[PDB]
Design a protein around this ligand. Structure first.
Ligand SMILES: O=C(O)CC1=NCN=C1
Ligand SMILES: [Zn+2]
Length: 414
């Protein structure tokens, strides 16, 4: 019967992002915009979302007047390292002094610095710290996010990070996708035996699988870290073990991480700053989603961003993320990422919106559950303090959120 819980009326602009799959190449530009719209919600799910009139015959218990505001699905942040101990502010001077990201790491700092902190922090402290950051992420519009482990580089801590991720997911509104990234860096105890280290991380997959602590396996394929050869062997093992594949590829040096991702049919390849044309073609060919992290580029103090236009021109499905982490991108503001995407990745507003909703969702195996406002989907949406979708990435560095809804309930009210 047409008796539902909630209905949003007088929506100035509604972006349903309705799609039948990830958006690649030209389809990323095809943004469907509905003026003067409405959204019907019942039992935490979307009943209807479209032109004014669709609410005809319906009786709702709660009518939300959006005052001509912009409404879109809740945002998806497909790549973060949410759970971590300590912070790296004391490393700012090293970067200012011109020491490269990799040289800091080779010095025993960077990821290895955060590893010490994360290993030392209690499970309760990590949970408390992550809740704060995750709620801030929520306040900026993120209702679904991917979170990677990778600051343990040992059985105890990696497992602790995954358990924390599980707690967070079950104790607050943001839905989380967990990724095991024990292969983030080479810990001191394995400096001269990286392959053995990788095997130790692989030995953790069975129990991680049994306890459902992670759905994907990631790795940092980079100079001074893991080679393409080691990454292939590791990822193939991960796939046999039943995990989806992700990879931090061609972030700094052009090693061919992208090509490997495509060959292994990874769900996504992330960073891709130094990816070759062959890598771009391989990504498009395999349907591997290219998750760009313009925040990390900007934060590293660099001027060369990933070649997003070339990727889109070549048929790649592009996505974006904060890469929220203490070392190279300490920001929860996915909206700023949208702005950076426009100004430095040279993406259009349309492409950007598809990037943080539909493509972000598919990049983490949630293509059928998030990023779209259509019948059956969980009622996850954002009512913005803006009249149109171009305004969001246009006005930068702030929070444009008016209200955030998760499962049909307002969880953020500004
Ligand atoms: O530096 C960090 O903590 C995070 C990072 N991993 C790979 N690139 C950046
Ligand atoms: Zn990352």
């Amino acid at each position: 019967p047409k008796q539902i819980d909630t209905i949003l009326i007088n929506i100035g602009q509604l972006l349903t992002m309705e799609s039948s799959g990830p958006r690649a190449g030209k389809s990323m530009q095809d943004l469907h915009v509905i003026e003067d719209a409405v959204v019907g919600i019942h039992e935490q799910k979307i009943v209807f979302a479209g032109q004014k009139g669709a609410e005809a015959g319906y009786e709702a218990d709660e009518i939300i007047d959006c005052s001509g505001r912009l409404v879109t699905p809740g945002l998806v942040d497909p790549h973060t390292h949410l759970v971590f101990g300590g912070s790296r502010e004391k490393e700012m001077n090293l970067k200012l002094q011109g020491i490269s990201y990799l040289d800091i790491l080779a010095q025993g700092g960077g990821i290895l610095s955060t590893v010490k902190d994360t290993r030392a922090a209690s499970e309760e402290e990590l949970l408390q710290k992550a809740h704060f950051h995750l709620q801030r992420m929520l306040s900026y519009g993120t209702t679904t996010a991917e979170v990677k482990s990778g600051y343990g580089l040992e059985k105890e801590t990696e497992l602790k990070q995954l358990r924390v991720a599980k707690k967070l997911h079950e104790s607050q509104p943001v839905d989380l996708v967990s990724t095991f990234m024990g292969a983030h860096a080479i810990p001191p105890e394995y400096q001269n035996d990286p392959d053995d280290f990788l095997d130790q991380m692989l030995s953790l997959l069975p129990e991680i699988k049994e306890q459902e602590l992670a759905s994907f396996a990631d790795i940092f394929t980079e100079t001074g870290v893991f080679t393409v050869s080691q990454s292939r062997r590791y990822l193939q093992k991960a796939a046999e073990a039943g995990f989806g594949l992700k990879i931090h590829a061609d972030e700094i040096d052009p090693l061919g991480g992208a090509e490997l991702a495509g060959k292994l049919k990874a769900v996504s390849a992330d960073h891709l700053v130094g990816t070759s044309d062959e890598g771009i073609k391989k990504l498009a060919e395999a349907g591997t989603i290219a998750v760009l992290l313009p925040g990390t580029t900007f934060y590293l103090g660099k001027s060369t961003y990933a070649r997003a236009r070339a990727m889109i021109d070549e048929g790649v499905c592009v996505s974006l993320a904060t890469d929220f982490n203490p070392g190279s991108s300490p920001t929860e503001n996915i909206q700023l990422i949208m702005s950076i995407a426009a100004l430095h990745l040279k993406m259009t507003a349309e492409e950007i919106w598809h990037a943080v909703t539909v493509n972000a969702a598919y990049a983490i195996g949630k293509g059928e559950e998030a990023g779209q406002l259509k019948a059956g989907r969980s009622a996850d949406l954002v009512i913005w303090q803006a009249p149109n979708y171009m305004y969001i990435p246009y006005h930068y560095g702030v929070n444009h959120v008016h209200q955030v809804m998760k499962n049909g309930t307002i969880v953020v009210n500004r």
